[PDB]
Amino acid sequence: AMFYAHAFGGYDENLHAFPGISSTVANDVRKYSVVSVYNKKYNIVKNKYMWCNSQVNKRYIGALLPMFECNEYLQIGDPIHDLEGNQISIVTYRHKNYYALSGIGYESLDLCLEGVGIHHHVLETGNAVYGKVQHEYSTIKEKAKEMNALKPGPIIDYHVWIGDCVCQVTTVDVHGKEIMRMRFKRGAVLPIP
Amino acid sequence: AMFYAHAFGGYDENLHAFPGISSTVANDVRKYSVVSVYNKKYNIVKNKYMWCNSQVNKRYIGALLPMFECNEYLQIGDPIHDLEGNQISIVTYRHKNYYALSGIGYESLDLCLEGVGIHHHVLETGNAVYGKVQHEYSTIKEKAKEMNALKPGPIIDYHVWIGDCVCQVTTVDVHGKEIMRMRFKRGAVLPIP
Numbered sequence A, B: 001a002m003f004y005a006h007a008f009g010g011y012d013e014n015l016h017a018f019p020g021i022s023s024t025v026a027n028d029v030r031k032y033s034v035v036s037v038y039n040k041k042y043n044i045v046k047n048k049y050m051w052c053n054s055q056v057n058k059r060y061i062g063a064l065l066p067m068f069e070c071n072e073y074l075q076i077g078d079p080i081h082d083l084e085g086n087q088i089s090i091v092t093y094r095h096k097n098y099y100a101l102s103g104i105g106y107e108s109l110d111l112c113l114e115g116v117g118i119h120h121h122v123l124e125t126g127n128a129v130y131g132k133v134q135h136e137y138s139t140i141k142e143k144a145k146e147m148n149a150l151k152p153g154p155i156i157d158y159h160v161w162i163g164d165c166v167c168q169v170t171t172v173d174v175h176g177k178e179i180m181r182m183r184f185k186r187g188a189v190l191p192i193p
């Protein structure tokens, strides 16, 4: 099994594509509760995930990935093993002491970035979203009321909203009108560069 | 608590909107495991759902919803109760002996249909998807290569792929070239008219 890091130019379109990784195998990483890095065991976080993305050659590869808690600092490319000793992934992204387990995970977004932009936001708990902005529901409700009569235009930007209780993807036209919204019913965090 | 069926002209833009229903309340229906219709108890199916949608005023309202198994024929508008006599929903959609429990559910898709169409397909287990078609993976891999060069045009159609092991949403241009792919890691069925 080979795992190549996109952060080091390892992207290969003819290989399986996951956030941060081009691989010769497609491992279902949802099935692991414990992982090992340099012979140290780390527990997978239950019911909270990490939204990770790589962006190569105008291709956006995003997905909610499992994550394990590790107080030690790990670097991009460190091999991740199961308890039997098989390498299942490489270290890609971290949020403080959370590290993404990159592979076939939960909800995913694959997008061609030609002519559009994509932006990621931490969704504050209880806030609503309209288009490219979040705020309190009362502020959002009226923003929606005034943007309603606008004739929708073509999508020009995607916005990914990652919250503790829900995740969402929205799209907007040039005027900021919300064209489409998808929700994922999972809680997660975004990587911290 | 009022539940109005979109099928009977019950859509109210100022009410909460769910597949087939406009309601004065917003019930989280993921929590119920048993419901009651006309004083008969029915079990909610575990780990499999129903993708349901209504389309009103150029608005698409789709969601993955819980379903309960019931051999009696039920009709749109039949009140659905919890085990404490509280009404929580109304019958909207059916798949053979599966009946949707509409409300706040799992993954959702909200879309302004202005200028675009949307289509739903039963994803055959083990089939792959590119753009507007499903087929065996090797055939799909070839279709992707043939469409690889074609210049990406405006999104004109959404396609909802509902399978036993995964659900997906794709967007395509006029040629059928794939713009976006979103995966929902849930199994589900589609209503049968």
Ligand SMILES: Nc1ncnc2c1ncn2[C@@H]1O[C@@H]2CO[P@@](=O)(S)O[C@@H]3[C@H](F)[C@@H](CO[P@@](=O)(S)O[C@H]2[C@H]1F)C[C@H]3n1cnc2c(=O)[nH]cnc21
Residues within 6 Å of the ligand: A125, A126, A127, A128, A129, A137, A165, A166, A168, A183, B015, B016, B017, B018, B026, B104
């Ligand atoms: N009328 C309101 N009065 C006061 N506060 C409101 C109202 N509406 C929304 N908020 C607030 O805004 C946030 C975003 O909610 P949102 O639309 S993104 O979706 C939410 C989440 F997926 C989940 C709960 O989310 P939560 O409670 S932690 O946060 C909410 C809340 F804090 C259920 C979804 N859900 C809620 N209502 C509908 C609906 O009618 N249709 C489809 N799904 C719906």
Ligand SMILES: Nc1ncnc2c1ncn2[C@@H]1O[C@@H]2CO[P@@](=O)(S)O[C@@H]3[C@H](F)[C@@H](CO[P@@](=O)(S)O[C@H]2[C@H]1F)C[C@H]3n1cnc2c(=O)[nH]cnc21
Residues within 6 Å of the ligand: A015, A016, A017, A018, A026, A104, B125, B126, B127, B128, B129, B137, B165, B166, B168, B183
């Ligand atoms: N290379 C291949 N060789 C042979 N057959 C293949 C290959 N690729 C796909 N198929 C077939 O097509 C179906 C849909 O696959 P899809 O693209 S929707 O993604 C699938 C589903 F989400 C989940 C279960 O699907 P399942 O196993 S029952 O069916 C598959 C399979 F029958 C695993 C996901 N998954 C697989 N690989 C990747 C990847 O590289 N990235 C992100 N997710 C990936």
